[PDB]
Amino acid sequence: RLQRRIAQLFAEDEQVKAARPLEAVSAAVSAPGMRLAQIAATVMAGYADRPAAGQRAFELNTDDATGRTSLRLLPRFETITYRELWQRVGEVAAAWHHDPENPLRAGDFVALLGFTSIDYATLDLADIHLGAVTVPLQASAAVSQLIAILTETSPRLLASTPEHLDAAVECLLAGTTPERLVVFDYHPEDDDQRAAFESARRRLADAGSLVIVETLDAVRARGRDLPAAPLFVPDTDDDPLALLIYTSGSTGTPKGAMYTNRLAATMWQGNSMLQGNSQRVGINLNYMPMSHIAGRISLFGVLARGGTAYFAAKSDMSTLFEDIGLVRPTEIFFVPRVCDMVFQRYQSELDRRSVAGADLDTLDREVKADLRQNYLGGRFLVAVVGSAPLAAEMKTFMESVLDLPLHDGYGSTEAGASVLLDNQIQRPPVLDYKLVDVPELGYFRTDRPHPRGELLLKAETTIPGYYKRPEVTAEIFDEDGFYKTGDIVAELEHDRLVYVDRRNNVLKLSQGEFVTVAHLEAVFASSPLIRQIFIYGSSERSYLLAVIVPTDDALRGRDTATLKSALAESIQRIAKDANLQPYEIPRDFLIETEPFTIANGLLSGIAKLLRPNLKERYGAQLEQMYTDLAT
Ligand SMILES: Nc1ncnc2c1ncn2[C@@H]1O[C@H](COP(=O)(O)O)[C@@H](O)[C@H]1O
């Protein structure tokens, strides 16, 4: 089936045919001495006349009752070519390099606060063009954390989308180093965005700040009237810092993972099997933020193949399936949250269509085909899931919907994106690994069917450490230079590993049994009644609780007691299918009707649960539930 789809595609679909990578360009990009900016330059020249990037079309609607004008999204995308994108980059790079008073120099830090967009890419590529160090701030971060990062990095420039200007201005009023505030993704005919921009300008002026607040459009206009900027190419023996990717773990404090010029280059053309992908057509919907490695690889990896990178219209996945259905990408990268959304759409549709006359011999297949064709676009050739665990049942469901394999990719900000693919160690980039016993969590080389322990890694893609964090950096490498992943794995055989959970997520119950709470959250995602779930336990208790956000369908026509009974029954079925032990099953739960979001601090920018924030939010209620059940 797949092979026939591909043949039809490459015979009838002119968009796909025109986007086929050029072997000659990929060869040039691969050349041994190519540095980061040269890769960018070579790609843009090589694919000049092709569509490179796309964003939702929009119009400006004026409500005559409020008199207010608002940007409204239209059901189509518009593109710009490689030539056009590189022209924009060149204008920015010229504006920054040839500035009469205070030009930017290689090694200077530039902070960017946004999502992922044509403008974001423009700014990011301009940093690369000049050898500036990009600091892609996590939009999920609290202002105090943003200020701490700015203090650490002392950037000379801050760029922000209008949605984040309130945060940007607070950062600048706190006396941080940026000399200019560049507003991008900016539509001045939208009254809300114009208000945000004018407020920023007014507030900084009122404070007596010397910061210059300007639009990206104005920066480009200035650059248009200047000579071309030099392309930064480091000494053959040098590998300067190019990028910091901030990441947070046990202690919620963000650390800046150091990406050198060479490490950042792997995001364009990697060396692994999946980041190699050299001849696959790359028509992509980018919905992960540029503040995450996955978002960067999604953009740069597609540009390196002369494909077309389409940007999702919103950062909270609220337009995701509209966007994917319009773009009809040839490849899709899933995070488990998105798989959940596909499953939840499937369940809603199946339930709705399961009427008296329905042929249940066939309805399941129809609903999945609807998802495959109309929600996922029907043109994808490959699919990958990563960033968090996907449970076996959900993986089987997804493969049934996709009608092709869902590759599981394991990696990290520290170690590299390509560590495991379908449980196989990837060489390159991996050089060596070992498992280390974790006695306190009951994981040993001598275990049940398979050795278990913490994964320690050597790889070409490991970071040198975290920016200005000497002690933390010392603690993440062992005495033989292995990076300590903090992740528990099971070793099926040499180079074949199964991810278990993060060490941090392993909980010992009062009876002595260990539970892996993120793994379990993934298992229960398969309940048709659960929209989201957070599992919580206490080492002083013998059983687990959960905070459950029910689906809208689950809530309909039920009171709390009946809803809890329904959820308990579904959890029981899921647990039996997944062969769980009794202690791995949540026994009681908090019903939460407000979903976890980026905005309320409970999801990350890639839609992973923020466990420290969930515990802060629900911990007191959950502990009270333990006592109330006790009494
Ligand atoms: N395929 C995967 N399966 C399970 N967990 C994963 C997978 N990929 C990444 N992770 C988790 O995500 C962490 C790294 O997240 P990040 O540095 O933000 O890229 C890892 O240490 C794992 O806990």
Side-chain angles (χ1 to χ4, degrees):
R1 275 197 300 271
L2 170 53
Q3 198 39 70
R4 306 235 315 152
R5 289 187 44 223
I6 295 165
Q8 162 163 21
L9 210 60
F10 287 62
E12 297 183 1
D13 189 319
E14 303 298 342
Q15 191 193 359
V16 172
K17 288 156 71 164
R20 299 189 75 159
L22 288 179
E23 40 293 332
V25 179
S26 300
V29 167
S30 296
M34 297 286 285
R35 298 295 217 135
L36 180 62
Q38 294 174 305
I39 296 291
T42 292
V43 166
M44 299 289 145
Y47 291 120
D49 288 324
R50 292 185 181 195
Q55 59 176 35
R56 284 281 211 113
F58 61 90
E59 52 182 9
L60 292 157
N61 168 244
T62 302
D63 182 346
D64 283 320
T66 70
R68 280 230 140 185
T69 298
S70 294
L71 186 151
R72 164 156 47 72
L73 299 177
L74 298 166
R76 63 193 169 84
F77 280 79
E78 307 173 319
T79 58
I80 64 167
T81 63
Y82 283 81
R83 191 182 310 273
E84 287 166 340
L85 173 62
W86 192 237
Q87 167 64 21
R88 293 189 184 187
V89 171
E91 292 164 352
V92 177
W96 290 351
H97 174 81
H98 292 290
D99 194 78
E101 291 85 3
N102 298 280
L104 203 67
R105 301 296 306 270
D108 288 343
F109 287 70
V110 175
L112 311 177
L113 183 58
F115 172 42
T116 187
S117 71
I118 303 252
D119 279 357
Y120 200 119
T122 300
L123 289 159
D124 211 284
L125 289 167
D127 286 352
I128 291 176
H129 197 303
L130 299 184
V133 180
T134 299
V135 185
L137 298 168
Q138 298 172 298
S140 64
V143 166
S144 63
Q145 294 178 315
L146 294 179
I147 283 165
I149 296 317
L150 297 184
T151 306
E152 291 172 29
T153 56
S154 298
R156 300 195 51 204
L157 192 141
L158 176 60
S160 181
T161 58
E163 315 82 74
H164 298 300
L165 279 174
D166 50 342
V169 172
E170 295 293 347
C171 287
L172 294 176
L173 292 175
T176 51
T177 51
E179 300 155 25
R180 299 186 163 256
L181 178 58
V182 175
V183 187
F184 66 99
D185 290 4
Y186 176 57
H187 312 86
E189 299 194 7
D190 182 278
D191 287 333
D192 285 349
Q193 303 190 15
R194 183 189 63 200
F197 180 78
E198 294 181 348
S199 180
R201 205 204 299 126
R202 169 189 325 126
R203 293 176 64 192
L204 292 166
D206 172 67
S209 178
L210 312 160
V211 171
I212 294 152
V213 183
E214 56 187 353
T215 70
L216 180 58
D217 282 348
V219 173
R220 283 171 53 205
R222 186 187 321 139
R224 241 166 252 140
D225 286 342
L226 296 166
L231 195 79
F232 177 75
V233 181
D235 217 29
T236 307
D237 302 318
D238 292 334
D239 192 23
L241 186 62
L243 166 72
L244 298 178
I245 301 177
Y246 275 85
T247 184
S248 300
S250 303
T251 320
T253 175
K255 317 171 295 293
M258 294 179 287
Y259 275 65
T260 63
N261 194 284
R262 290 215 166 275
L263 272 204
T266 69
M267 297 181 194
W268 287 74
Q269 206 192 276
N271 302 305
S272 71
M273 188 161 49
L274 192 50
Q275 286 179 258
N277 64 23
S278 294
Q279 250 191 255
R280 187 182 61 245
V281 175
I283 301 175
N284 198 282
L285 177 75
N286 305 79
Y287 67 97
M288 299 177 296
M290 292 287 286
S291 53
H292 193 272
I293 180 61
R296 314 208 130 236
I297 289 166
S298 295
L299 171 61
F300 296 137
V302 160
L303 296 175
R305 292 176 279 143
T308 304
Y310 292 84
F311 298 103
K314 304 291 196 176
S315 67
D316 64 347
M317 294 189 183
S318 66
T319 65
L320 190 55
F321 289 111
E322 310 167 36
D323 290 339
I324 295 173
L326 286 170
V327 169
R328 303 187 295 130
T330 55
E331 58 191 26
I332 302 173
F333 174 79
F334 294 95
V335 296
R337 189 74 50 192
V338 181
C339 298
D340 288 350
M341 293 172 72
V342 176
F343 180 74
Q344 286 167 35
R345 189 51 171 171
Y346 164 83
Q347 290 291 342
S348 184
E349 280 297 279
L350 185 61
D351 288 7
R352 180 179 70 77
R353 288 178 60 185
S354 290
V355 301
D359 181 13
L360 296 189
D361 296 329
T362 261
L363 186 59
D364 177 77
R365 289 194 27 104
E366 294 189 12
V367 176
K368 291 178 177 172
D370 180 24
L371 292 168
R372 175 184 320 124
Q373 299 182 280
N374 302 321
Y375 290 78
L376 296 178
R379 206 157 58 159
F380 56 86
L381 305 181
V382 75
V384 176
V385 62
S387 87
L390 193 72
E393 179 64 18
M394 188 67 69
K395 195 176 173 132
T396 293
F397 166 79
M398 285 299 303
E399 288 184 336
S400 194
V401 169
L402 298 161
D403 204 39
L404 47 73
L406 177 58
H407 305 283
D408 185 351
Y410 163 86
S412 63
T413 299
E414 292 87 346
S418 301
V419 178
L420 293 169
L421 188 68
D422 299 317
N423 307 110
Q424 295 288 156
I425 287 288
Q426 296 298 291
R427 308 174 185 260
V430 175
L431 299 175
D432 197 14
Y433 77 89
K434 59 174 169 172
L435 273 64
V436 175
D437 289 5
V438 183
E440 310 69 27
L441 299 181
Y443 298 112
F444 299 94
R445 202 99 177 104
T446 51
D447 280 352
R448 191 51 81 157
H450 314 107
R452 297 187 302 184
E454 180 179 359
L455 177 61
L456 271 60
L457 277 175
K458 283 181 184 169
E460 292 191 301
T461 48
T462 58
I463 62 170
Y466 305 107
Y467 194 65
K468 287 179 177 180
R469 300 214 189 327
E471 294 313 321
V472 177
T473 292
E475 290 290 308
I476 69 169
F477 295 103
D478 81 352
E479 63 188 349
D480 289 330
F482 288 87
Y483 166 64
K484 306 182 211 175
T485 62
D487 296 332
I488 303 302
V489 300
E491 182 183 59
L492 305 175
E493 66 192 48
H494 177 69
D495 271 15
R496 191 176 174 84
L497 310 175
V498 171
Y499 174 92
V500 179
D501 209 335
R502 309 258 299 139
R503 285 185 56 150
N504 285 168
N505 289 338
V506 178
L507 169 76
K508 184 191 193 185
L509 301 169
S510 58
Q511 358 147 94
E513 305 287 353
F514 296 99
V515 300
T516 48
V517 295
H519 167 74
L520 288 178
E521 284 155 1
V523 171
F524 288 112
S526 284
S527 163
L529 288 66
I530 304 184
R531 180 177 181 170
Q532 302 166 315
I533 180 172
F534 163 59
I535 287 178
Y536 178 86
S538 168
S539 48
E540 286 76 63
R541 307 285 178 180
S542 63
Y543 65 94
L544 294 171
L545 305 172
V547 175
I548 294 174
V549 181
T551 61
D552 287 348
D553 286 341
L555 288 159
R556 217 181 28 99
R558 297 197 205 256
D559 55 36
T560 298
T562 302
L563 173 56
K564 286 210 193 186
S565 176
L567 284 160
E569 188 168 86
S570 185
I571 283 164
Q572 286 293 326
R573 291 186 202 101
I574 291 305
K576 182 174 305 182
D577 291 341
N579 300 317
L580 299 183
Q581 299 297 124
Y583 55 83
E584 296 177 297
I585 306 174
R587 171 183 191 149
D588 221 272
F589 31 82
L590 276 181
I591 306 293
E592 172 61 276
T593 53
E594 303 195 23
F596 312 150
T597 63
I598 293 172
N600 58 26
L602 303 183
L603 296 187
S604 76
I606 62 168
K608 188 182 294 189
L609 296 188
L610 290 177
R611 197 160 312 269
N613 281 348
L614 284 161
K615 285 183 181 167
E616 162 204 340
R617 171 63 186 81
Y618 297 115
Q621 291 163 271
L622 289 162
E623 286 291 345
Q624 184 66 49
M625 186 175 328
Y626 271 134
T627 304
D628 294 340
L629 294 173
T631 64

